[PDB]
Design an enzyme around this catalytic site. Structure first.
Site, PDB file in Angstrom:
ATOM      1  N   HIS A  75      89.985  65.309  48.987  1.00  0.00           N
ATOM      2  CA  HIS A  75      88.873  64.372  48.667  1.00  0.00           C
ATOM      3  C   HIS A  75      89.344  62.913  48.543  1.00  0.00           C
ATOM      4  O   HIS A  75      88.470  62.048  48.485  1.00  0.00           O
ATOM      5  CB  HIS A  75      87.971  64.899  47.544  1.00  0.00           C
ATOM      6  CG  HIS A  75      88.504  64.933  46.149  1.00  0.00           C
ATOM      7  ND1 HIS A  75      88.962  63.815  45.458  1.00  0.00           N
ATOM      8  CD2 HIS A  75      88.505  65.948  45.251  1.00  0.00           C
ATOM      9  CE1 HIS A  75      89.272  64.177  44.211  1.00  0.00           C
ATOM     10  NE2 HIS A  75      88.980  65.485  44.065  1.00  0.00           N
ATOM     11  N   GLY A  88      90.278  59.613  37.819  1.00  0.00           N
ATOM     12  CA  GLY A  88      91.609  59.198  38.306  1.00  0.00           C
ATOM     13  C   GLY A  88      92.665  60.254  38.100  1.00  0.00           C
ATOM     14  O   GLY A  88      93.776  60.027  38.519  1.00  0.00           O
ATOM     15  N   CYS A 117      92.739  63.305  39.283  1.00  0.00           N
ATOM     16  CA  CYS A 117      92.826  64.250  40.418  1.00  0.00           C
ATOM     17  C   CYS A 117      94.214  64.154  41.033  1.00  0.00           C
ATOM     18  O   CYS A 117      94.743  63.045  41.133  1.00  0.00           O
ATOM     19  CB  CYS A 117      91.726  64.045  41.440  1.00  0.00           C
ATOM     20  SG  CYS A 117      90.102  64.394  40.714  1.00  0.00           S
TER      21      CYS A 117
HETATM   22  O1  LIG Z   1      84.841  65.996  39.174  1.00  0.00           O
HETATM   23  C1  LIG Z   1      85.213  65.141  39.976  1.00  0.00           C
HETATM   24  C2  LIG Z   1      86.528  64.399  39.885  1.00  0.00           C
HETATM   25  N1  LIG Z   1      87.056  64.583  38.557  1.00  0.00           N
HETATM   26  N2  LIG Z   1      87.996  65.506  38.272  1.00  0.00           N
HETATM   27  N3  LIG Z   1      88.258  65.466  36.998  1.00  0.00           N
HETATM   28  C3  LIG Z   1      87.455  64.543  36.377  1.00  0.00           C
HETATM   29  C4  LIG Z   1      87.321  64.219  35.033  1.00  0.00           C
HETATM   30  C5  LIG Z   1      86.365  63.255  34.691  1.00  0.00           C
HETATM   31  C6  LIG Z   1      85.579  62.657  35.714  1.00  0.00           C
HETATM   32  C7  LIG Z   1      85.677  63.019  37.066  1.00  0.00           C
HETATM   33  C8  LIG Z   1      86.666  63.982  37.405  1.00  0.00           C
HETATM   34  N4  LIG Z   1      84.308  64.808  41.016  1.00  0.00           N
HETATM   35  C9  LIG Z   1      83.000  65.426  41.045  1.00  0.00           C
HETATM   36  C10 LIG Z   1      82.697  66.188  42.304  1.00  0.00           C
HETATM   37  C11 LIG Z   1      81.616  65.902  43.368  1.00  0.00           C
HETATM   38  C12 LIG Z   1      81.616  66.902  44.420  1.00  0.00           C
HETATM   39  S1  LIG Z   1      82.851  67.891  44.095  1.00  0.00           S
HETATM   40  C13 LIG Z   1      83.423  67.319  42.689  1.00  0.00           C
HETATM   41  C14 LIG Z   1      84.595  63.780  41.962  1.00  0.00           C
HETATM   42  C15 LIG Z   1      83.966  62.538  41.806  1.00  0.00           C
HETATM   43  C16 LIG Z   1      84.223  61.534  42.763  1.00  0.00           C
HETATM   44  C17 LIG Z   1      85.160  61.785  43.747  1.00  0.00           C
HETATM   45  C18 LIG Z   1      85.443  60.673  44.740  1.00  0.00           C
HETATM   46  C19 LIG Z   1      85.887  60.839  45.998  1.00  0.00           C
HETATM   47  N5  LIG Z   1      85.995  59.628  46.487  1.00  0.00           N
HETATM   48  C20 LIG Z   1      85.668  58.748  45.573  1.00  0.00           C
HETATM   49  N6  LIG Z   1      85.331  59.396  44.457  1.00  0.00           N
HETATM   50  C21 LIG Z   1      85.783  63.037  43.910  1.00  0.00           C
HETATM   51  C22 LIG Z   1      85.534  64.013  42.951  1.00  0.00           C
END
Ligand SMILES: O=C(Cn1nnc2ccccc21)N(Cc1ccsc1)c1ccc(-c2c[nH]cn2)cc1
Ligand SMILES: O=C(Cn1nnc2ccccc21)N(Cc1ccsc1)c1ccc(-c2c[nH]cn2)cc1
EC number: 3.4.19.12
Lengths: 306, 306
Positions: B41, B143, B145
């Site tokens: 991602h 952040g 991830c």
């Molecule tokens: O859940 C996540 C990413 N993530 N992981 N741990 C976290 C803890 C607090 C907040 C966000 C967090 N997502 C949500 C999602 C949506 C479809 S699948 C999963 C997420 C949000 C944004 C992004 C992204 C990619 N490019 C820019 N932002 C990726 C995952």
């Protein structure tokens, strides 16, 4: 989201751990620049611990009475001296992995990360509060002496604890990195025991703020309290009295959540009187007191889940 | 004495963390030899997450679409490929801090240490169980991830988790280091939710053994149980059914304490039916399920406090 008892990353400290042997006694040392720090009881036999005179035991040692092992490497001791309840060994080699560091004496109620070590080899890391009774509820076995406690700020390691002793109740006692004991404890055999302890009120309030930042308000109420009326309830439940200095420290968490400190005190009073009625806060069935206000700001989002 | 949720020392993993940027998206990578591993991602905008076709997004990138920062050093990407839900970036430099390592897929109920990281910089370490519902109750912010989970055995790091997602209930989902999700989760926007969870029975029994090793027997009783009669009670209290394989795994802890596994099951049945009557075990008011039998043997004395 989430809220865990989180330790600092231990690598900067791992690179400083060594093994110190004097005769048949082995424990851990901390190697910074060209000095190794370790508990002075390394110079004792188990029997010497009954009534040791450390001055009289140490003057009978030379530099070559001490073996220091850093991984597979023998460090040569070229000097030694006692500082309170530590030995300082000068070695012929400066630790190339020495981080930026300080020595700090932490205050009761403050938290730190422990790197448990055996034979100079790190085994595990966990977070500890310094209890009001100057003990820590650690996890230590024989050979763990010389294991250290620390905090990290911007790549500077603040060392604050060196492990010396397990007390009869299974809790742990030790020194700062000047060799001064936390609490009234001594490195010899006495009837010494952990004193009465209290719940760290400031930390419980910080952790209730953490729960609101993470989106939970169930335990709040429409009431307020004075500091005196809160403290009558604190005394009944063996909580530390709340002070105006504690109220001031909770300013930033109060401002992030919009809950006045004395309104959060009224919420805590109600939780102490009524209990949690089968509910949890941040997944806990009890009021947690091992997170400082600093710990909460370090770990929680800066954006409240409103 | 003592018993703490203890993480492995994190240094070997700290030396592998880097930052990976693709356009306006930044997260953490794991740098081993000349490969950087990170969640695929990283190639998405926030809007791409609604319905991404990763094959179609990736073919639009070159090697120079990716920036990798190791501390202050820019690593040059010389190859890229997708493996399940990870990106593998080949870089021009082998990590000189690469430890001995393996990739392992852990089983539900097993524990691991998480090194929470932001912008390639390690922030904290804590221990996690893999829940039966294939989530972890972590502590992660935006952040985080690409943060990893691991175990260490004899200086070999077994990597077992890479962080991808927070679910709507605030628990966490991710992949093994082949990019296969734990659980039925996907790296795109769906109605996906954490399934029903259960208490990890084997771990509760291990932790009762820990309490006896550390010298406490208050919760034992004169009764025994069959496996079937224990499981009727387990079903009522949302515990995982106990199996003969679980009984066999508890052999060593049973032998160290002299308490037959089914006698310890009868003790647990009584604790589930009667509660703890205001008492604690290893300082807990609840039955702990995030320590494996391995964790207990790793941390407790090999000598029972009889
Ligand atoms: O859940 C996540 C990413 N993530 N992981 N741990 C976290 C803890 C607090 C907040 C966000 C967090 N997502 C949500 C999602 C949506 C479809 S699948 C999963 C997420 C949000 C944004 C992004 C992204 C990619 N490019 C820019 N932002 C990726 C995952
Ligand atoms: O408490 C300790 C050492 N210690 N620290 N953490 C531990 C955890 C489990 C078991 C022992 C532990 N003592 C007891 C003591 C006695 C007077 S003052 C303190 C201890 C036991 C032996 C020795 C020793 C010195 N030389 C050889 N053995 C030192 C401290």
């Amino acid at each position: 989201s989430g809220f865990r008892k989180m330790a600092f990353p231990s690598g900067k400290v791992e690179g400083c751990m060594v093994q110190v042997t004097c005769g048949t006694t082995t424990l851990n040392g901390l190697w910074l620049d060209d000095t190794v720090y370790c508990p002075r009881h390394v110079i004792c036999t188990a029997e010497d611990m009954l009534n040791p005179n450390y001055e009289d035991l140490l003057i009978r040692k030379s530099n070559h009475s001490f073996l220091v092992q850093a991984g597979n490497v023998q460090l040569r001791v070229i000097g030694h001296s006692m500082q309170n309840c530590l030995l300082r060994l000068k070695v012929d080699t400066s630790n190339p992995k020495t981080p930026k560091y300080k020595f700090v004496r932490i205050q009761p109620g403050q938290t730190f990360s422990v790197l448990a070590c055996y034979n100079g080899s790190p085994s595990g890391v966990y977070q500890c509060a310094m209890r009001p009774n100057h003990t820590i509820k650690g996890s230590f076995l024989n050979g763990s002496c010389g294991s250290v406690g620390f905090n990290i700020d911007y790549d500077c390691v603040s060392f604050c604890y060196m492990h010396h002793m397990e007390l009869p109740t299974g809790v742990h006692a030790g020194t700062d990195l000047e060799g001064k004991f936390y609490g009234p404890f001594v490195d010899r055999q006495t009837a010494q025991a952990a004193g009465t302890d209290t719940t760290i009120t400031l930390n419980v309030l910080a952790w209730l703020y953490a729960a609101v930042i993470n989106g939970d308000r169930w335990f709040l109420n429409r009431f307020t309290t004075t500091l005196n009326d809160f403290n009558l309830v604190a005394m009944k439940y063996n909580y530390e009295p709340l002070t105006q200095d504690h109220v001031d420290i909770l300013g930033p968490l109060s401002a992030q959540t919009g809950i006045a400190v004395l309104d959060m005190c009224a919420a805590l009073k109600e939780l102490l009187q009524n209990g949690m009625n089968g509910r949890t806060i941040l997944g806990s069935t009890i009021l947690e007191d091992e997170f400082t206000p600093f710990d909460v700001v370090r770990q929680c989002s800066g954006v409240t889940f409103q």
